[PDB]
Design an enzyme around this catalytic site. Structure first.
Site, PDB file in Angstrom:
ATOM      1  N   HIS A  78       0.819  -1.219   0.000  1.00 17.68           N
ATOM      2  CA  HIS A  78       0.000   0.000   0.000  1.00 17.68           C
ATOM      3  C   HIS A  78       0.851   1.267   0.000  1.00 17.68           C
ATOM      4  CE1 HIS A  78      -3.324  -2.771   1.348  1.00 17.68           C
ATOM      5  NE2 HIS A  78      -3.936  -2.040   0.428  1.00 17.68           N
ATOM      6  N   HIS A  82       1.165   1.666  -5.812  1.00 20.93           N
ATOM      7  CA  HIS A  82      -0.192   1.121  -5.821  1.00 20.93           C
ATOM      8  C   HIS A  82      -1.233   2.179  -6.249  1.00 20.93           C
ATOM      9  CE1 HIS A  82      -3.931  -0.661  -4.777  1.00 20.93           C
ATOM     10  NE2 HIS A  82      -4.111   0.106  -3.719  1.00 20.93           N
ATOM     11  N   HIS A 118      -6.913   7.225  -2.551  1.00 21.22           N
ATOM     12  CA  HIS A 118      -7.801   6.307  -1.825  1.00 21.22           C
ATOM     13  C   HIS A 118      -7.133   5.483  -0.706  1.00 21.22           C
ATOM     14  CE1 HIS A 118      -6.044   2.973  -4.065  1.00 21.22           C
ATOM     15  NE2 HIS A 118      -6.707   2.169  -3.253  1.00 21.22           N
ATOM     16  N   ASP A 119      -5.797   5.400  -0.692  1.00 22.13           N
ATOM     17  CA  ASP A 119      -5.077   4.694   0.388  1.00 22.13           C
ATOM     18  C   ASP A 119      -4.057   5.594   1.077  1.00 22.13           C
ATOM     19  OD1 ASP A 119      -6.127   2.085   0.667  1.00 22.13           O
ATOM     20  OD2 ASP A 119      -5.045   1.381  -1.114  1.00 22.13           O
ATOM     21  N   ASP A 230      -8.975  -0.699  -7.811  1.00 25.73           N
ATOM     22  CA  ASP A 230      -8.203  -1.150  -6.646  1.00 25.73           C
ATOM     23  C   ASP A 230      -7.590  -2.539  -6.866  1.00 25.73           C
ATOM     24  OD1 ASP A 230      -7.151  -0.644  -4.114  1.00 25.73           O
ATOM     25  OD2 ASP A 230      -9.109  -0.429  -3.146  1.00 25.73           O
TER      26      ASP A 230
END
Ligand code: EOS
Ligand code: MG
Ligand code: ZN
Length: 339
Positions: A78, A82, A118-119, A230
């Site tokens: 992550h 990514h 998003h992460d 994702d």
């Protein structure tokens, strides 16, 4: 900082100049040198015409891009690479599917930015750990769930509200608000529990057939697309799925080790002494990844190859499963590992 000066003053490179295959589903964005990725983010936004469309300030977009990039830590999976490959897949959806036939431009724009964010600030642990760890994030978010995802959104807000990084601030108050609500919805949609929650709504939508005047169909489709981004390492060749399994389990097992050190017992998939990777990877593909790309296929017939690739990769895992059993002697020619 040199990344900054170059991003500001060198100009936005055409995507074709990055790679002749850059907009193909066969392209592997992880092949791009990490130093070139902020530039590729701008190239993709330029190629989708969003910079001109929404009158985005390029210096502001540049700053925002680098803030987002430096907002990722470096756990094995992550990390920024990514987020970048997830964002690139969003771009692939735009180029290869007729999204504009399903979604408003602002929704597509929000999806791409959401992919980038998003992460954000992921620490290499799942939501369950934050609770068991008594992290600051659990204190902040645990009573509402989606702990890490709420933190990813809050980080995105923090970035947007950093001086010189608010790429949206010329939007009308109406559209500005829509963008925040879209990003929140979309980033919260990356929690697996959310996906499981909405799954039969996604099916029903796929059954009755997508309705462009149905705004909750828009919202559902945005979640489906986000999750398909994702999980998009599963849509490349075998080497990508193999390599990403390695990064994922490295990250997982690092969490499990920590859970043992604080005297707790990790989920089996987090426990390097119990976890059997082919089974776990095959399960994840069959129950999570393939149903998502199948829904993608039911809605967009041109997404069939994505589903076929994921399934084909799943079958590749079955074919190499036997290799996790030591037959003959180890490469050592030694049984010393028994002692
Ligand atoms: C309970 N099982 C897991 O969390 C799990 C198990 C095996 C996995 N294997 C691969 C290859 C993988 N790739 N991405 C993820 C992933 C996805 C996440 O949410 C994304 C939405 C769409 C659900 C969150 C975290 C991860 Cl690591 N995974 C796995 C996730
Ligand atoms: Mg996540
Ligand atoms: Zn992710």
């Amino acid at each position: 900082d040199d990344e900054y000066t170059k991003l500001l003053h060198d100009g936005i490179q055409p995507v074709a100049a990055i790679d002749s295959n850059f907009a193909s589903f066969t392209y592997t964005p992880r092949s791009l040198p990490e130093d070139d990725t902020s530039m590729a983010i701008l190239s993709m936004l330029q190629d989708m015409n969003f910079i001109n469309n929404y009158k985005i300030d390029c210096p502001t977009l540049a700053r925002f891009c680098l803030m987002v990039k430096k907002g990722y830590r470096d756990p094995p999976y992550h990390n920024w690479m990514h987020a970048f490959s997830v964002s690139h897949f969003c771009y692939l959806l735009y180029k290869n599917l007729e999204l504009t036939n399903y979604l408003e431009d602002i929704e597509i724009f929000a999806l791409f930015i959401s992919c980038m964010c998003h992460d954000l600030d992921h620490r290499g642990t799942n939501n369950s750990f934050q609770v068991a760890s008594k992290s600051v994030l659990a204190a902040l978010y645990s009573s509402e769930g989606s702990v890490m995802e709420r933190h990813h959104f809050a980080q995105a807000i923090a970035i947007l509200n950093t001086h010189g990084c608010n790429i949206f601030d010329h939007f009308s108050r109406k559209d500005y608000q829509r963008m925040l609500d879209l990003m929140r919805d979309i980033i919260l949609a990356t929690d697996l529990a959310h996906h499981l929650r909405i799954f039969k709504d996604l099916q029903k939508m796929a059954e009755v057939g997508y309705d462009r005047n149905n705004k909750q169909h828009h919202r559902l489709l945005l979640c489906l697309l986000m999750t398909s981004c994702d999980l998009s390492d599963q849509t490349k060749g075998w080497k990508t799925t193999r390599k990403i399994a390695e990064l994922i389990y490295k990250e997982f097992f690092s969490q499990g080790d920590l859970e043992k050190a604080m005297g707790n017992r990790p989920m089996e998939m987090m426990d390097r002494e119990k976890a059997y990777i082919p089974e776990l990877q095959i399960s994840f593909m069959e129950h999570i990844a393939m149903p998502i790309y199948k829904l993608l296929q039911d809605l967009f017939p041109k997404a069939a190859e994505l589903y076929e690739r994921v399934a084909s990769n799943r079958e590749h895992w079955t074919k190499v499963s036997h290799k996790f059993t030591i037959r003959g002697l180890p490469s050592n020619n030694s049984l010393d590992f028994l002692d």
